[PDB]
Amino acid sequence: GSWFFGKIPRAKAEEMLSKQRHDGAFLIRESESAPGDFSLSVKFGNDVQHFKVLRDGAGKYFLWVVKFNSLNELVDYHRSTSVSRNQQIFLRDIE
């Protein structure tokens, strides 16, 4: 399951992830018109929830609190740690 999709629409990201069989199924998309402005599109339960990945300076990526140097480091941290702080919900690969 290949997670990175360079720059595709918000409606096309919601259509592909709602069809997927896996709980936690995600893709990281770039926002349409804004360069270097990312969004983690991740299915939590049944709804595809778009958490904004902001950039601090050079090569840095922060959505939750602490910054993550690469987009692969942002994925592998929240694959075991929770994004939504109540029930534990993690990042799983697409079909």
Residue 80 has which token pair?
């075991």
Tokens of 82: 């929770």
Q: CA-to-CA distance for 5 and 40, rounded, in angstroms?
A: 11
Tokens of 6: 């360079």
Q: How many structural domains comprise the chain?
A: 1
- Determined by NMR
Identity of the residue numbered 12: K
CA distances from 48 to 17, 23, 69 (A): 7, 11, 25
User: At which residue do the structure tokens 């339960």 appear?
Assistant: 45
Q: Which CATH number goes with the domain that contains 80? A: 3.30.505.10
Separation CA 25–CA 51 (nearest Å): 14
> For 12, how many CA atoms within 13 A lie in the half-sphere containing its CB?
10
Q: Say if CB 89 and CB 80 are below 8 A apart.
A: no
Residues 6+ apart with CB under 8 A from 46: 18
Backbone break loci in the chain, preceding residues, C–N > 2.5 A? none
Host domain of residue 7: 1-95
